[PDB]
Amino acid sequence: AKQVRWCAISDLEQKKCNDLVGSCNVPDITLVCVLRSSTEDCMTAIKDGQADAMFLDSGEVYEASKDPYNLKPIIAEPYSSNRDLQKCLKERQQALAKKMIGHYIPQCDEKGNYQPQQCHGSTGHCWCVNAMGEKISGTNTPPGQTRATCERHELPKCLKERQVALGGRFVPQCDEKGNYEPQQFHGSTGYSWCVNAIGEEIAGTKTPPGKIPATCQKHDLVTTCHYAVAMVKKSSAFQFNQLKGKRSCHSGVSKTDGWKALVTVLVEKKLLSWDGPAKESIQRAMSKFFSVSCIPGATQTNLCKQCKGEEGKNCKNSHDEPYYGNYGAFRCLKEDMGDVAFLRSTALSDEHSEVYELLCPDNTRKPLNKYKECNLGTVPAGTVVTRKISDKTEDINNFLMEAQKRQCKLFSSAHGKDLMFDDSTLQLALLSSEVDAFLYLGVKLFHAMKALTGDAHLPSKNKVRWCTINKLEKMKCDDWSAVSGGAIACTEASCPKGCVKQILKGEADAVKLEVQYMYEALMCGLLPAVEEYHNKDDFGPCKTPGSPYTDFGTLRAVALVKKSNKDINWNNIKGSCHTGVGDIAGWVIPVSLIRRQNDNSDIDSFFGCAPGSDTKSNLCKLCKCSLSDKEAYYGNQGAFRCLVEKGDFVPHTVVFENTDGKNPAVWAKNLKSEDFELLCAPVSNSCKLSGIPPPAIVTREESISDVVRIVANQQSLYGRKGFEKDMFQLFSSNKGNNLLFNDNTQCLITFDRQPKDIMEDYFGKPYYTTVYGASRSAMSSELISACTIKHCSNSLEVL
Ligand SMILES: NC(=O)OC[C@@H]1N=C(N)N2CCC(O)(O)[C@@]23N=C(N)N[C@@H]13
């Protein structure tokens, strides 16, 4: 028996909330409505633990994630992407979950695709549909009428471009499932360029051979986009560059559609004379820009004089102010209390097409139905937020999910529009607990919000902020900063992924990453400034960069078998054991190579000890089977214990250690380099699955030059064989082992960027093609999504 306290900012919001408390029965969750006078007071009440959840505009998210609020987005409306997999099955499940009779339930085939014809059973209407479930225009037919004959529209645009290129020289490379890869290489002419979601080239990305290709960003095609627009009456005659001195009405000071997009556009067009933040308030500059306005939540009295709320409620971020919100701003414009209204496109209807039109930032006027051509930018959906501590997220999610299933009236009310949520909300879905303001808004929008609130960091060109993942790293990096003479500074994160996030947020400058994190790091636009170099035998390239290198100290992944103690080859591996499921030398390389060949599900349908592999899968018992050396078959040493008992995939080094006597335990003491070999050959000969790229110190592109030079100078000072190495060592520490770099690192070598693909330019084509399929869509995550450019379209109808 739990309760969820929703915070209402107005009397109408409390009325709708009490309507829900009366009419919506959710088992084991009681809805309680706490009343405040404004958005900010509700944010504070949630921060104080007096309320649990509220709905915020996207423009309010960033300031919500900071003091004195410290709120986090938890529940948001999902958008339709061209990367949605198995969409028909999920839509059918969701429809079946709704406790109502007669609603449309999508009809799916045996494979999970949409049936080309979709029918609403209770009404008898039928229509046609493409591979994403979008209705073909005009194909809706009622009962008792000849139905539209429906074709399968399953072939993506890219694969069709392929097969209109191999019949009778541009052949485009595509991601698995027929999406365009963001980077295109012309195999004949050697040119490379970048493309958006539908494969049309973006301007200024084409590069000749030998030259360095442009950085290609991942794109996602998204449907139903809402926009920030300036709405005006057709009777007026002013244009956008004549906004100064006019009367205006806004949805809110903290909303994107009401304020932030407008200010960004005014700054870009140089219409708004204003310094930077912390020198002038944006609100003071806007108060000097407009004569008299209604901007709810504003603290300048002229930006509030046109507001219509009664005293104590005037200009508040609350529906108690009649001019608050998108519909409130439209009301102000209609009642001639302002000359222009700044609001979301969702408040536009064709009823207003007679009197109203849209003011475009290019100094033209257009009708309301041109809002996709006449806007101040896209406005992402609002979100339900709670405390960052996330104590009540489960209860809130359960309540909203059950209320949506039981058809409770969350997204409409007789009392008014946009009360507790946006009325345009179709559904609310749960977000990953990883999602914060940064992940929700995305890198670009996050930096825009950061700059707009005066938090933007201008990095130093002579100092490098190194990110640490634990307290020992922080201590060693503190020693390094104390001896660096202002060249090195220290930041703290929980894990390497947090360090990548901090670098993206402008809170840190560089971090060392192992291979696992490199895919995400390169997807988000980071680059390797330097790389760990482990060749103990040469040391040539360390003191002098470019004393050319023959071996980087890279580990080489192979499978270790016997000189005819056993009879194994690659073709009959079916029917050994592996170090771990997470290890890259082993598991990742062999599994990727196995299931890139064939097709299969190797999880059991291949071999006859791989710790972390469920329990007792057909292996995992030849060793219980935990991802630690507390079982004797974990790691390189335990995987070598796998090959001597129950004999039948490891780095090459694993033989050279323990062979010849170096590890004595009884089993590995009397073993020799002649008794064990590798399949592709003698144990030292290259008979390898693939080479593993070295760990990379990554940073932003603009910071590459500064990071490399500062690291080079510091390396000349400290580390292995340094002028003042007696003061500090880079690759060793009394605080711990392998802290900021692997202790066996010979040095750091500046990454030489080749005129190839950055993914191949780091991983190497064998590793890239084997592990990630040479595709930018091999893995998806919240971070990769936050670094993906959302591109809008009236529909996905490009099939
Ligand atoms: N093992 C090794 O040290 O390779 C040499 C060095 N390091 C990489 N990780 N690379 C990635 C791929 C590559 O092209 O071989 C190379 N790419 C550049 N820019 N320099 C090379």
Q: How many domains does the chain have?
A: 3
Q: Tell me the C-alpha to C-alpha distance, in Å, between residue 200 and each of 161, 172, 183, 559.
A: 12, 11, 11, 44
Please indicate, yes or no, whether residues 433 and 485 belong to a single structural domain of this protein. Answer: no
Residue type at position 295: I
**How many Å apart are CA 143 and CA 377, to the nearest integer?**
42
Neighbours of 389 (CB within 10 A): 10
Residue 729 lies in a domain: yes
Q: What is the helix, strand, coil percentage profile of the chain, to 5?
A: 30, 15, 55
Ligand 1 contacts CB of residue 459 (under 6 A): no
Ligand 1 contacts CB of residue 69 (under 6 A): no
Domain ranges, residue 730: 464-552+693-786
Q: Which amino acid residue places its CA nearest to atom 20 of ligand 1?
A: 752
Chosen domain end from 350, 379, 408: 379
Q: Which among 625, 629, 642 has a CA at the least distance from the CA of 676?
A: 642
State in Å: Cα 745 to ligand 1 middle: 16
State in Å: Cα 624 to ligand 1 middle: 39
**How many Å apart are CA 465 and CA 488, to the nearest integer?**
6
Whether the Cβ atoms of residue 375 and residue 32 lie closer than 8 Å to each other: no
State how beta strands 650-651 and 556-558 pair: antiparallel
State in Å: Cα 771 to ligand 1 middle: 17
Q: Tell me the C-alpha to C-alpha distance, in Å, between residue 13 and each of 330, 415, 427.
A: 19, 8, 19
Chosen domain end from 399, 424, 450: 450
Residue 776 lies in a domain: yes
CB crowding 639-652: b at 16 or more within 10 Å, else e? bbbbbeebbbbbbb
In the chain the first and final C-alpha atoms are separated, in Å, by: 49
**How many Å apart are CA 547 and CA 750, to the nearest integer?**
12
Please indicate, yes or no, whether residues 524 and 436 belong to a single structural domain of this protein. Answer: no
Please indicate, yes or no, whether residues 361 and 419 belong to a single structural domain of this protein. Answer: no
**How many Å apart are CA 754 and CA 528, to the nearest integer?**
12
Please indicate, yes or no, whether residues 390 and 372 belong to a single structural domain of this protein. Answer: no
Please indicate, yes or no, whether residues 375 and 390 belong to a single structural domain of this protein. Answer: no
- From the alpha carbon of 552, which atom of ligand 1 is closest? 3
State in Å: Cα 560 to ligand 1 middle: 26
Chosen domain end from 327, 352, 379: 379
Please indicate, yes or no, whether residues 283 and 361 belong to a single structural domain of this protein. Answer: yes
Residue type at position 506: G
- From the alpha carbon of 752, which atom of ligand 1 is closest? 19
Please indicate, yes or no, whether residues 297 and 414 belong to a single structural domain of this protein. Answer: no
Q: In this structure, what DSSP letter does residue 571 have? A: G
**How many Å apart are CA 337 and CA 399, to the nearest integer?**
41
Q: Which among 651, 621, 646 has a CA at the least distance from the CA of 636?
A: 651
Please indicate, yes or no, whether residues 415 and 479 belong to a single structural domain of this protein. Answer: no
Q: What is the resolution of this structure in A?
A: 2.5
Ligand 1 contacts CB of residue 693 (under 6 A): yes
Q: Which amino acid residue places its CA nearest to atom 2 of ligand 1?
A: 552
**How many Å apart are CA 139 and CA 136, to the nearest integer?**
6
**How many Å apart are CA 288 and CA 302, to the nearest integer?**
9
Going through 175-283 in order, the beta strands assigned E by DSSP cover: 183-185, 192-194, 219-223, 226-233, 248-250
**How many Å apart are CA 748 and CA 716, to the nearest integer?**
11
Residue 200 lies in a domain: no
Please indicate, yes or no, whether residues 373 and 233 belong to a single structural domain of this protein. Answer: yes
- Specify burial of residue 166 (Cβ count, 10 A radius: 0-12, 13-18, 19+): exposed
Sign of the torsion angle spanned by Cα atoms 131, 137, 139, 143: positive
Q: Tell me the C-alpha to C-alpha distance, in Å, between residue 740 and each of 512, 520, 696, 749, 750.
A: 7, 20, 12, 15, 17
Residue 90 lies in a domain: no
Ligand 1 contacts CB of residue 106 (under 6 A): no
State in Å: Cα 761 to ligand 1 middle: 7
> CA 255, 259, 261: angle at the middle one, nearest 5?
95
Please indicate, yes or no, whether residues 249 and 322 belong to a single structural domain of this protein. Answer: yes
Residue 579 lies in a domain: no
Q: Which amino acid residue places its CA nearest to atom 4 of ligand 1?
A: 552
Helix residue ranges per DSSP H, 67-194: 87-97, 157-163
Residue 598 lies in a domain: no
Task: With H, G, I as helix, E, B as strand and everything else as coil, classify residue 667.
Answer: coil
Ligand 1 contacts CB of residue 6 (under 6 A): no
CB crowding 127-140: b at 16 or more within 10 Å, else e? bbbbbbbbebeebb
Whether the Cβ atoms of residue 233 and residue 246 lie closer than 8 Å to each other: no
Whether the Cβ atoms of residue 772 and residue 201 lie closer than 8 Å to each other: no
Residue labelled with tokens 């693939």: 690
Residue type at position 778: A
Whether the Cβ atoms of residue 447 and residue 471 lie closer than 8 Å to each other: no
Q: The tokens of 628 are what?
A: 């630690």
**How many Å apart are CA 83 and CA 105, to the nearest integer?**
22
State in Å: Cα 588 to ligand 1 middle: 20
Helix or strand holding residue 54 (H, E): strand 54-56
What order of strands is seen across the sheet that includes strand 71-76?
54-56, 383-387, 71-76, 429-430
Neighbours of 755 (CB within 10 A): 14
Residue 273 lies in a domain: yes
**How many Å apart are CA 292 and CA 308, to the nearest integer?**
13
Ligand 1 contacts CB of residue 546 (under 6 A): no
Domain CATH number, residue 300? 3.40.190.10
Please indicate, yes or no, whether residues 338 and 487 belong to a single structural domain of this protein. Answer: no
State in Å: Cα 704 to ligand 1 middle: 17
Helix or strand holding residue 14 (H, E): helix 11-23
Sign of the torsion angle spanned by Cα atoms 226, 227, 230, 232: negative
**How many Å apart are CA 532 and CA 512, to the nearest integer?**
9
Contacts of 731 (CB under 8 A, 6+ apart): 719, 720, 741, 742, 743, 744, 745, 747
Q: Which among 237, 228, 238, 287 has a CA at the least distance from the CA of 262?
A: 228
**How many Å apart are CA 695 and CA 521, to the nearest integer?**
12
Ligand 1 contacts CB of residue 554 (under 6 A): yes
Query: Hey, which of 688, 762, 768 would you mutate to test ligand 1's pocket, going by the most ligand atoms within 8 Å of its Cβ?
Result: 762
**How many Å apart are CA 639 and CA 301, to the nearest integer?**
73
**How many Å apart are CA 491 and CA 487, to the nearest integer?**
14
**How many Å apart are CA 476 and CA 469, to the nearest integer?**
11
* Crossing angle for the helix pair 765-772 and 589-596, to the nearest 10 degrees: 70
Whether the Cβ atoms of residue 128 and residue 136 lie closer than 8 Å to each other: yes
Backbone angles phi, psi at 311, to 5 degrees: -60, 140
Peptide bond into 78 cis (omega under 30): no
- From the alpha carbon of 756, which atom of ligand 1 is closest? 14
> CA 113, 114, 115: angle at the middle one, nearest 5?
115
> CA 275, 279, 284: angle at the middle one, nearest 5?
75
Residue 775 lies in a domain: yes
Q: Which among 37, 4, 9, 35 has a CA at the least distance from the CA of 21?
A: 4
Question: Which residues, in sequence order, are bridge partners of residue 748?
Answer: 532
State in Å: Cα 598 to ligand 1 middle: 30
Whether the Cβ atoms of residue 518 and residue 763 lie closer than 8 Å to each other: yes
State in Å: Cα 214 to ligand 1 middle: 19
Ligand 1 contacts CB of residue 753 (under 6 A): yes
Ligand 1 contacts CB of residue 754 (under 6 A): yes
State in Å: Cα 502 to ligand 1 middle: 26
Neighbours of 544 (CB within 10 A): 7
Please indicate, yes or no, whether residues 370 and 298 belong to a single structural domain of this protein. Answer: yes
Q: Which amino acid residue places its CA nearest to atom 11 of ligand 1?
A: 762
What order of strands is seen across the sheet that includes strand 464-468?
488-492, 464-468, 510-513, 696-699, 527-533, 747-750
